[PDB]
Amino acid sequence: MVKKLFFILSKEDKNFLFFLLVFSVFVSFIETFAISLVMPFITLASDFSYFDRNKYLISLKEYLNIPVFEIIVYFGVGLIVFYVFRALLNAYYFHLLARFSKGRKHAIAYKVFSKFLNINYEKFTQKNQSEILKSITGEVYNLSTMISSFLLLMSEIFVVLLLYALMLLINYKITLFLSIFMVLNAFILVKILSPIIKKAGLRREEAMKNFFEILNTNLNNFKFIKLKTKEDGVLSLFKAQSEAFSKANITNESVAAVPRIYLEGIGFCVLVFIVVFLVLKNESDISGILSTISIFVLALYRLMPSANRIITSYHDLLYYHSSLNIIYQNLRQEEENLGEGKLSFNQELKICNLSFGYEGKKYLFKNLNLNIKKGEKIAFIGESGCGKSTLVDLIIGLLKPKEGQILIDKQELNASNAKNYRQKIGYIPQNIYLFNDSIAKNITFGDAVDEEKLNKVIKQANLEHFIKNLPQGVQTKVGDGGSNLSGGQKQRIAIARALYLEPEILVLDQATSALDTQSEAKIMDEIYKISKDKTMIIIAHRLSTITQCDKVYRLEHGKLKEEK
Amino acid sequence: MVKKLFFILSKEDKNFLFFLLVFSVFVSFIETFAISLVMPFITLASDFSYFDRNKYLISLKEYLNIPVFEIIVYFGVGLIVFYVFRALLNAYYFHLLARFSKGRKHAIAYKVFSKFLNINYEKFTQKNQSEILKSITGEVYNLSTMISSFLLLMSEIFVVLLLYALMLLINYKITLFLSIFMVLNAFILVKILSPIIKKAGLRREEAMKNFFEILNTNLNNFKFIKLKTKEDGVLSLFKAQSEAFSKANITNESVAAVPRIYLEGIGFCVLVFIVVFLVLKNESDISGILSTISIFVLALYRLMPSANRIITSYHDLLYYHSSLNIIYQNLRQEEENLGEGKLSFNQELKICNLSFGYEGKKYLFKNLNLNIKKGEKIAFIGESGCGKSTLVDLIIGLLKPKEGQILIDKQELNASNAKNYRQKIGYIPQNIYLFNDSIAKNITFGDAVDEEKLNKVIKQANLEHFIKNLPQGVQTKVGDGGSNLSGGQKQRIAIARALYLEPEILVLDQATSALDTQSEAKIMDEIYKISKDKTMIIIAHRLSTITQCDKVYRLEHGKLKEEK
Numbered sequence A, B: 001m002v003k004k005l006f007f008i009l010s011k012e013d014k015n016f017l018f019f020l021l022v023f024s025v026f027v028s029f030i031e032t033f034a035i036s037l038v039m040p041f042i043t044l045a046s047d048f049s050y051f052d053r054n055k056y057l058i059s060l061k062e063y064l065n066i067p068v069f070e071i072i073v074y075f076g077v078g079l080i081v082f083y084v085f086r087a088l089l090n091a092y093y094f095h096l097l098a099r100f101s102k103g104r105k106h107a108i109a110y111k112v113f114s115k116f117l118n119i120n121y122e123k124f125t126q127k128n129q130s131e132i133l134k135s136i137t138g139e140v141y142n143l144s145t146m147i148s149s150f151l152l153l154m155s156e157i158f159v160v161l162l163l164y165a166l167m168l169l170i171n172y173k174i175t176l177f178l179s180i181f182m183v184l185n186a187f188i189l190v191k192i193l194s195p196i197i198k199k200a201g202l203r204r205e206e207a208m209k210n211f212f213e214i215l216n217t218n219l220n221n222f223k224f225i226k227l228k229t230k231e232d233g234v235l236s237l238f239k240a241q242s243e244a245f246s247k248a249n250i251t252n253e254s255v256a257a258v259p260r261i262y263l264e265g266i267g268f269c270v271l272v273f274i275v276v277f278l279v280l281k282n283e284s285d286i287s288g289i290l291s292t293i294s295i296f297v298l299a300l301y302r303l304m305p306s307a308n309r310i311i312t313s314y315h316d317l318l319y320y321h322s323s324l325n326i327i328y329q330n331l332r333q334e335e336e337n338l339g340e341g342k343l344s345f346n347q348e349l350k351i352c353n354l355s356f357g358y359e360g361k362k363y364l365f366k367n368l369n370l371n372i373k374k375g376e377k378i379a380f381i382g383e384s385g386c387g388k389s390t391l392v393d394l395i396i397g398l399l400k401p402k403e404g405q406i407l408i409d410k411q412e413l414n415a416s417n418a419k420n421y422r423q424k425i426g427y428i429p430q431n432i433y434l435f436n437d438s439i440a441k442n443i444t445f446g447d448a449v450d451e452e453k454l455n456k457v458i459k460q461a462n463l464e465h466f467i468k469n470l471p472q473g474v475q476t477k478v479g480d481g482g483s484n485l486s487g488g489q490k491q492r493i494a495i496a497r498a499l500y501l502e503p504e505i506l507v508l509d510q511a512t513s514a515l516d517t518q519s520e521a522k523i524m525d526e527i528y529k530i531s532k533d534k535t536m537i538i539i540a541h542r543l544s545t546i547t548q549c550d551k552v553y554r555l556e557h558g559k560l561k562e563e564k
Helices: A011-036 A037-042 A057-062 A073-118 A121-126 A131-172 A172-191 A194-220 A222-226 A232-255 A258-275 A288-319 A320-332 A388-395 A419-424 A452-460 A487-499 A520-530 B011-036 B038-044 B057-061 B071-118 B120-127 B129-170 B173-190 B194-221 B222-226 B232-253 B258-277 B288-316 B322-332 B387-394 B418-423 B452-460 B487-502 B520-530
Strands: A380-381 A505-508 A535-538 A549-556 A561-562 B378-381 B505-508 B535-538 B553-554 B560-562
Touching: A011 A073, A011 A288, A011 B038, A011 B452, A037 A073, A073 A320, A073 B258, A073 B288, A073 B487, A121 A520, A121 B222, A131 A288, A131 A320, A131 B194, A172 A288, A194 A232, A194 B129, A194 B322, A232 B071, A232 B222, A258 A452, A258 B038, A258 B071, A288 B194, A288 B288, A380 A388, A419 B560, A487 B387, A520 B520, A561 B173, B011 B038, B011 B071, B011 B129, B011 B288, B038 B288, B057 B194, B071 B520, B120 B232, B129 B288, B129 B322, B173 B194, B173 B258, B173 B288, B194 B232, B288 B452, B452 B487
Parallel strands: A380 A535, A380 A549, A505 A535, B378 B535, B378 B553, B505 B535
Antiparallel strands: A549 A561, B553 B560
C-alpha cells in the first residue's frame, strides 16, 4: 500500500521530501546539542577550577591560544551565536515544511482538477459537485498537512530517542525511576481524569440545553402567565433548572483545574523524594546535585512537546490521511474521454432512434426521432424537466445514446469525431456564471485575445454602447458574476462568449422565467438577426420566445410530438 | 459605582465575595512559600554541611532532636506535605471561584427573570425577546465570570508583586536587568513582532478568499468546458491563483514559529552575558551559580502564568462586564405592575371610548365602542395587525387604555381590580408552546396537580382516547412542543390548559391556516359546546369558524362594524 504514495508525487518533490527528511533527523541532533551543552558550561562556570585540573580541560588551554579567563567568554559567545543560529535554523526548517506542504496542495490539486476536466461528461455530472470540490480542494489540504505532520513526527521521535538515550547515559539510575514514574503519570491523567472530565463536560452541555429550553418556552407563554396571575409557578421551574445548570457547570469548571495543580504539587513532590533518596549514599558534589537536575529538568521540558507533537500527529495520521489516499486512487486512475477526427455538416442533423436512460434507470425516450437541417433554428417546448435539455444534449456532442446513431450528413456521430462536433457549438445559458475578471475574459474564457475578432463579436453582440459607457472600458472587473454586471449584460456577454466560437449550432438553454418582455423580446430579435448564418437549438421552457422559430417540437411523456 | 454590585448581590454573595478576596491573597502567599522554600532546602539538602554553623541552624540540631543522617529525610517531608497541601488548596480555591461565579449565574439570572415576570405586558411585548433572553442568560454569564476574573486578577497581581519583591531582595542587581529586559522583550514581541503578524493574517485570509472564490466559478461552467475540448484554458488560471494561495499559506506557517524559536534563542542567550559579567568577581560558590539560577528560573517560571492570567482577565475586564452591568442596572431598578382587590362579572362588558396606541404610534382605534353580554360568544374579524388582537388584549386584563373605562357590570376596570379580572380568562392560543414535561403539567401550567380537577378538565377537553393510547399516559413527556405530540392533541391540551383555569371568558387567538376541516371544523364545535356555559372572544382570522358566533365585529380603519 506504499506504492500508492509514490504514484502521486513528482521527482522534484521527492528531492525536496528526502531533503526534509535529512533535515528532520538533523534538527534532532541540533536540539539535543542545544540542551546537552548546558551541563558542561554550567558545571565549568563555577567553580573557576577545572582549568587547573582535569585531563581534558587543560589541552585546549595549553594548546597556546587562550590564557585562563577567556575560556568562558569565548565559549559562551560561541553558544549564543549557536542559539541565534538555531533561531534562524528551525525557522528555515519550518519554512521548507510549509513550502512543501502547500506547494503540493497547489500541485496535486492541479492534477485532480485537470483529470476531472478530461473525464467524460456523464461520469462528471453523475456525482454531485460537493464530491468533486472536496476531491480537488479538501483531500489535497488534508494530504499536505498530513505529510508535514509525518516529517515533524520523524523529527520528534528522533528527538525523543536521542534525549532519552542522553538521559540514559548521564544518570543511569534516575532515568529509569522517572520512566516508570512517567508512564504512571500519564496513566493518572488519561485513565482516571479524562473520562470524568468528559462526564462533567457532557453534564454541563446537557444542562445548558435544558435550561435554555424551558426558559424559551416560558418566554413563549407569557400571555398565558400574565393572565394566570400566578408567576411563581414557572419560577418553580426556572429556579429548578437553573440550579442544575449551576451545579453541572461548576463540577465541570472545577474538574478542569485538577490536572495542572496536580502537576505542580507532584512537580515538586517528585523532586524532594529523589533528593531524600540520594542522601543515603554520598555523591552530591555541591554543584553536582544541581548539574544533573538542571539537565534532567531541561530534558523532561524538551521531551514533553515532542510527545505532544507525536500524539497530535498520531491523531492526524488516524483521523485524516488514509481516508483520502484510496479516494485519490479513484480519481487519477479514473478514465478520461477519447476521440480524434473530423466530420462535415452541410445538410442535416439526423437523430434516428435515440432511446436514452441514465445509470439507473428507466429510459427517457425509447425511440426519439427528428432531424435538423443546416440553419433550421428549432426550439424544444417542454413542460419543464421532461428531457428537452437532455434531448438537446444528445443532439449536441454530449451524452452517449443507448440505441441511437445521430447522423450528420448521413455519417454516424461517435467518439472519434465527437471532439470536432463538440467544438462547433456555443451555448448561451441565459442564467450565466461569470468568473471575477475583465469582461473580455470571461467571453474568451481565458484563451488570450484577438482584438479584431473580439471587436467583431462585441459589435455583433450589440454591446458597443455598454463598452463605451464603462470607465476602464473593456477591462472593467465583473466583481464576480455581477455584482458589477446585471442580467441583460450577463446574457449578451454570454452571447458574445458563444459567438467567439462562431459556428455552427447555437444552443440556447433558456431557463425558467426571464422577466419579461422588457428584456427577452428585444434580445430574441437580436438573436434572430445574428443567427442567420448558423443553425440554432433552443431549450425553451415556456412560450412567447418561439415566435420566429421555424420548427417547434413538444416533448412530453414520453415521446416527441410536432407542434408547428 | 460599586454600590450597583452590592444591590444585585445578596448578603451571602457579598460574604462569599470578600471570602474569595482574602482567599486569593492567601493562596498568593502559599504559592510564594512553595517557590521561596526551595532555596533553603536546595542549599541545605546537599551538601550535608550547614548544620555545624549558622546561628539558627545549630540551634534546632543542638535543641536535642536530631542525629546527623535524619535531618534531610525529616526536613524534606515538611515540604512534601506542604506541596500536597497546595495540591488540595489551589483545587479548593478554584472550586470556590467556580461555585461563586456560576452560583451567581443562578441566583442573579433568577432575579432578572423574576423581574421580567413582574413587569407589565406592553413594555414586555415592545422589546424583542432576543434582548430579554440575553439580559437574563447572556449578560449574567458575563458578570459572573467577570467577578471571578477580578478575584483571580487580584490573586495573580499579588503573586507578581511578592515574587518580584523576593527577586528584588535575593539579587538586587540581576532582577533589575531582567525587569528592564522584561519590558524590553515584551516590547520586542508586542511592538516589533505582534503588530506585524496581523498583516500576514489578514493577507492570508484574503488570498484564501480569492482562490476559493475563483475555484467555484470554474466548476460552475463545465458544460462549456466540455464543449470546448481544450482543458488548458482554466488550468492556466488555476495554476495562477492556487500558487498565490500556496505562497500566502507558507509565509504565515513559517512566521508562526518565529516568536517561540525567538523565545528559545533569547532564553539561552540571556544567560551567557550575565555569565560573562559575573565571572569578573569571586562570588560563585560552586552551587551558587546554579542556586541563584534555579531560584530566578523558578520565579520567572511562576511569573509567566501570573502575567498571562493578568492579561486574559484584563481582556475579560475590558471586552465584557461594563456593557452588561448598566444593562443589569436597567433590570433591577426596572418597575413592575400593581393592583389588588376583587371585581364581579355577571352582566355586560361595557367598553366606553377605548382609543389605544403603542409606544410610537398612530392610534389603532381612536374611540372604540361596544358591550359584551355574559355569554355572547363574539368574534373579531380583522386584517391581522389591524388591531383586533390589541382590541382583545384591552378587553381582557392586559394593556391600559388611553381614554377608556372598560366597565364590568358598570364598574371601571383599572389597575386595582385587574387581578381578579385577569384570573377569569382562559386563552387557548391555537399555535401553542408546551414545555418538555408530563402533559398534566403543562395543562396545570406548573401549578402542581389536583387529580379531581385535572380529570374533570381532560374530560371537558375530550382527550381520553389519546391518554389511554399513551404508554406513560398522562405522565408522558411532550418531548419539546411535539415532537411526541401532534396538532389536534396540542390544541386540545391547550384547551385543557385554559379550562383548568376554568371560567369565565374563553379567548381563542386563531392563527393563519390549519389545513383543514379535518381539524378546525371538529375542534370548533367542541369549543362551542364547552363555551355554552361561558362567554367567548375569538380573534378570528378567516371564516367558516364564526358560523356559530352570535356576534361578529369587523375592525377596519379605524372603527368596528357589526357583521351579523
